[PDB]
Enzyme design. Structure first.
Site, PDB file in Angstrom:
ATOM      1  N   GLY A  11      82.113  -4.122  25.439  1.00 49.29           N
ATOM      2  CA  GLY A  11      82.745  -5.211  26.158  1.00 49.29           C
ATOM      3  C   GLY A  11      84.189  -5.424  25.758  1.00 49.29           C
ATOM      4  N   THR A  14      87.210 -11.408  22.178  1.00 52.27           N
ATOM      5  CA  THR A  14      88.341 -12.328  22.204  1.00 52.27           C
ATOM      6  C   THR A  14      89.541 -11.750  21.460  1.00 52.27           C
ATOM      7  OG1 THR A  14      87.719 -13.497  20.167  1.00 52.27           O
ATOM      8  CG2 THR A  14      86.725 -14.255  22.228  1.00 52.27           C
ATOM      9  N   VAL A  17      89.055  -4.793  22.718  1.00 46.93           N
ATOM     10  CA  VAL A  17      87.943  -4.043  23.278  1.00 46.93           C
ATOM     11  C   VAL A  17      86.989  -3.627  22.159  1.00 46.93           C
ATOM     12  CG1 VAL A  17      89.150  -1.848  23.058  1.00 46.93           C
ATOM     13  CG2 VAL A  17      87.290  -2.078  24.702  1.00 46.93           C
ATOM     14  N   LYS A  33      85.684  -2.514  16.830  1.00 46.59           N
ATOM     15  CA  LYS A  33      86.520  -3.442  17.565  1.00 46.59           C
ATOM     16  C   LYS A  33      87.992  -3.154  17.303  1.00 46.59           C
ATOM     17  CE  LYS A  33      85.577  -7.796  16.914  1.00 46.59           C
ATOM     18  NZ  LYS A  33      84.652  -8.935  17.201  1.00 46.59           N
ATOM     19  N   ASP A  82      72.743  -9.433  22.391  1.00 47.07           N
ATOM     20  CA  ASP A  82      73.284 -10.722  21.970  1.00 47.07           C
ATOM     21  C   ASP A  82      72.398 -11.819  22.567  1.00 47.07           C
ATOM     22  OD1 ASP A  82      74.574 -11.720  24.653  1.00 47.07           O
ATOM     23  OD2 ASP A  82      75.369  -9.693  24.377  1.00 47.07           O
ATOM     24  N   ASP A 123      84.220 -20.408  16.256  1.00 44.70           N
ATOM     25  CA  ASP A 123      84.008 -20.061  17.655  1.00 44.70           C
ATOM     26  C   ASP A 123      82.614 -19.528  17.947  1.00 44.70           C
ATOM     27  OD1 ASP A 123      84.772 -19.743  20.364  1.00 44.70           O
ATOM     28  OD2 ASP A 123      85.235 -17.623  20.002  1.00 44.70           O
TER      29      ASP A 123
HETATM   30  N1  LIG Z   1      81.084 -10.151  25.779  1.00 41.91           N
HETATM   31  C1  LIG Z   1      80.529 -10.316  24.459  1.00 41.91           C
HETATM   32  C2  LIG Z   1      79.463  -9.252  24.211  1.00 41.91           C
HETATM   33  C3  LIG Z   1      79.054  -9.279  22.743  1.00 41.91           C
HETATM   34  N2  LIG Z   1      79.804  -8.235  21.999  1.00 41.91           N
HETATM   35  C4  LIG Z   1      79.296  -7.608  20.986  1.00 41.91           C
HETATM   36  C5  LIG Z   1      77.931  -7.218  21.007  1.00 41.91           C
HETATM   37  C6  LIG Z   1      77.326  -6.518  19.906  1.00 41.91           C
HETATM   38  N3  LIG Z   1      76.066  -6.164  19.947  1.00 41.91           N
HETATM   39  C7  LIG Z   1      75.114  -6.573  21.025  1.00 41.91           C
HETATM   40  C8  LIG Z   1      75.214  -5.655  22.227  1.00 41.91           C
HETATM   41  C9  LIG Z   1      75.222  -4.241  22.088  1.00 41.91           C
HETATM   42  C10 LIG Z   1      75.321  -3.411  23.233  1.00 41.91           C
HETATM   43  C11 LIG Z   1      75.409  -4.035  24.491  1.00 41.91           C
HETATM   44  N4  LIG Z   1      75.404  -5.407  24.658  1.00 41.91           N
HETATM   45  C12 LIG Z   1      75.308  -6.189  23.527  1.00 41.91           C
HETATM   46  C13 LIG Z   1      78.128  -6.209  18.750  1.00 41.91           C
HETATM   47  C14 LIG Z   1      77.601  -5.540  17.650  1.00 41.91           C
HETATM   48  N5  LIG Z   1      78.090  -5.784  16.392  1.00 41.91           N
HETATM   49  O1  LIG Z   1      76.696  -4.746  17.776  1.00 41.91           O
HETATM   50  C15 LIG Z   1      79.506  -6.604  18.731  1.00 41.91           C
HETATM   51  C16 LIG Z   1      80.101  -7.300  19.835  1.00 41.91           C
HETATM   52  N6  LIG Z   1      81.340  -7.634  19.775  1.00 41.91           N
HETATM   53  O2  LIG Z   1      82.194  -6.905  19.083  1.00 41.91           O
HETATM   54  O3  LIG Z   1      81.785  -8.711  20.394  1.00 41.91           O
END
Ligand SMILES: NCCCNc1cc(NCc2cccnc2)c(C(N)=O)cc1[N+](=O)[O-]
Length: 294
Positions: A11, A14, A17, A33, A82, A123
């Site tokens: 995704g 904030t 990417v 990130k 998430d 946040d």
């Molecule tokens: N728009 C916000 C989306 C939340 N974004 C994130 C989601 C994550 N995992 C859950 C996931 C994995 C694959 C597909 N959908 C969700 C992780 C992580 N640490 O694994 C990190 C972030 N992030 O860096 O923000």
């Protein structure tokens, strides 16, 4: 990447990417990130680096802080889903109370740990709460707000969600306290229970007024000092407080009691994460297995 192979785009956070990537050497799958402008503050890298030591089972591990080519990448442990997506997937039947309780309990343990180490999130939102198949939930992005200062926007004109912002932040307080995280978590707890955002404001003032319409316009009695807040206006409408029984039905009195303490207007009266863990609501807490479709 010098050591990573992008698996896909998770995704657009904030800060920048985010990609699901595999460490070509270790074979480890992580979330990478890319941090957003032109300079990269040295104070920011020191602060972020400190977070690599902030390890707890309910906190998403910051594996590495890579500062190369004058670019900043944050490598985090990877989790498959998430809470925002899980709540949407559970919209028809709702997340069972035992799982809501387990998640709230774990999130409070995570906050208690971070707060005891003087680290605030600032946040919290469903999108930064990550879950796995084992029934665990973890807080993602703790400490980044302070280390990277003002958030502003992601990096591609994306509207910031204000739904979980504590009232002291909306009223312009310049100094955040641990209480802002308890407020956000209270809002999330309510959303898991009712399956609808508690305060879905579409502007800073709409956010503030949605809170006031539900909890009553704050005054000096319930919030000493509120009328001297930076953005407080004597012209704010005065709404009467609603009953919690109407706000998060059909949550029981233990749950309503805890939520009410997490939503106190005065940050100083708001319950701490440590104290919340001792609330009677958690007398029968357990750790259920969620039905996760990946
Ligand atoms: N728009 C916000 C989306 C939340 N974004 C994130 C989601 C994550 N995992 C859950 C996931 C994995 C694959 C597909 N959908 C969700 C992780 C992580 N640490 O694994 C990190 C972030 N992030 O860096 O923000």
């Amino acid at each position: 990447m010098e050591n990573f192979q992008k698996v896909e785009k998770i995704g657009e956070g904030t800060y920048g990417v985010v990609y699901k990537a595999r460490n070509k050497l270790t074979g480890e799958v992580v979330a990478l990130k890319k941090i957003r402008t032109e300079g990269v503050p040295s104070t920011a890298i020191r602060e972020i680096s400190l977070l690599k030591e902030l390890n707890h089972p309910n906190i998403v591990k910051l594996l590495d802080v890579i500062h190369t080519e004058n670019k900043l990448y944050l490598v985090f442990e990877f989790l498959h889903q998430d809470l925002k997506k899980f709540m949407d997937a559970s919209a028809l039947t709702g997340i069972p109370l035992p799982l809501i309780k387990s998640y709230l309990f774990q999130l409070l343990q995570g906050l208690a740990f971070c707060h005891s180490h003087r680290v605030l999130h600032r946040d919290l939102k469903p999108q930064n709460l990550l879950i796995n198949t084992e029934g665990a939930i973890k807080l993602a992005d703790f400490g980044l707000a302070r280390a990277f200062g003002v958030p502003v926007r992601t990096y591609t004109h994306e509207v910031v969600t204000l739904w979980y912002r504590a009232p002291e932040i909306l009223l312009g307080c310049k100094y955040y306290s641990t209480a802002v995280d308890i407020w956000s978590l209270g809002c999330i707890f309510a959303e898991m229970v009712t399956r609808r955002a508690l305060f879905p404001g579409d502007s800073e003032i709409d956010q503030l007024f949605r809170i006031f319409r539900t909890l009553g316009t704050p005054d000096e009695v319930v919030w000493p000092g509120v009328t001297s807040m930076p953005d407080y206006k004597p012209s704010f409408p005065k709404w009467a407080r609603q009953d919690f029984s109407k706000v998060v039905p059909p949550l029981d009195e233990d749950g309503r009691s805890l939520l009410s303490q997490m939503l106190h207007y005065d940050p100083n009266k708001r319950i701490s994460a440590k104290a919340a863990l001792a609330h009677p609501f958690f007398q029968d807490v357990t750790k259920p297995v969620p039905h996760l479709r990946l």
